[PDB]
């Protein structure tokens, strides 16, 4: 149960890293206002984040 | 203590999902800036839920 | 290990509070449209550190 929880939380942290990365890009775009390249970056980082949290929930349900 | 931790993480995850919904709206508004008020309103919606969720996780975590 | 997990999840949660704060300031800069942007950077870097620490503490579980 502990190893599981540990596994689930690890994926949760990955998801947070990705949103942070996404927030990072947002900061850059706000200043500006190559936004096109940043908007794409933001979207993919947000993609991985969403996959990451879905895996976290899925595993958590395993506990 | 496990069920508590698990229940704590669940709300954490929900809070994470809500930031993600807020971020996707961000990407949309930033794109647009090139209804925006309705989108911002929407960002506040999911951002409030996110805060409610993590406040839930935090409270639950103290229960362990 | 129940202690480390909890301690590690606490940093995760703090990391999330910081992202929400970063998000709030985001809504603020969006409605505005400098210092607010610097503020954003601040709560975001804090988030980065808190998440960094959660991982580290996690690794010892």
Curated annotation (Swiss-Prot), chain B:
The inactive precursor F0 is glycosylated and proteolytically cleaved into F1 and F2 to be functionally active. The cleavage is mediated by cellular proteases during the transport and maturation of the polypeptide. Belongs to the paramyxoviruses fusion glycoprotein family. Homotrimer; disulfide-linked F1-F2. Interacts with the Glycoprotein G; this interaction involves both head and stalk regions of glygoprotein G. In pre-fusion state, found as a dimer of trimer. The gene is F. It comes from the Viruses. It is found in: Virion membrane; Host cell membrane. Class I viral fusion protein. Under the current model, the protein has at least 3 conformational states: pre-fusion native state, pre-hairpin intermediate state, and post-fusion hairpin state. During viral and plasma cell membrane fusion, the heptad repeat (HR) regions assume a trimer-of-hairpins structure, positioning the fusion peptide in close proximity to the C-terminal region of the ectodomain. The formation of this structure appears to drive apposition and subsequent fusion of viral and plasma cell membranes. Glycans are attached at residue 44. Residues 1-21, 39-64 form a coiled coil. This is Fusion glycoprotein F0.
UniProtKB/Swiss-Prot annotation, chain C:
Glycans are attached at residue 41. Residues 1-21, 36-61 form a coiled coil. The inactive precursor F0 is glycosylated and proteolytically cleaved into F1 and F2 to be functionally active. The cleavage is mediated by cellular proteases during the transport and maturation of the polypeptide. It comes from the Viruses. It is found in: Virion membrane; Host cell membrane. Class I viral fusion protein. Under the current model, the protein has at least 3 conformational states: pre-fusion native state, pre-hairpin intermediate state, and post-fusion hairpin state. During viral and plasma cell membrane fusion, the heptad repeat (HR) regions assume a trimer-of-hairpins structure, positioning the fusion peptide in close proximity to the C-terminal region of the ectodomain. The formation of this structure appears to drive apposition and subsequent fusion of viral and plasma cell membranes. Belongs to the paramyxoviruses fusion glycoprotein family. Homotrimer; disulfide-linked F1-F2. Interacts with the Glycoprotein G; this interaction involves both head and stalk regions of glygoprotein G. In pre-fusion state, found as a dimer of trimer. This is Fusion glycoprotein F0. It comes from Nipah virus. The gene is F.
């Amino acid at each position: 149960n502990i190893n599981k929880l540990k596994s689930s939380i690890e994926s949760t942290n990955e998801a947070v890293v990705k949103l942070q990365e996404t927030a990072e890009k947002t900061v850059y775009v706000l200043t500006a206002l190559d936004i096109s390249s940043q908007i794409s970056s933001m979207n993919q980082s947000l993609q991985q984040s969403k996959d990451y949290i879905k895996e976290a929930q899925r595993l958590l349900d395993t506990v």
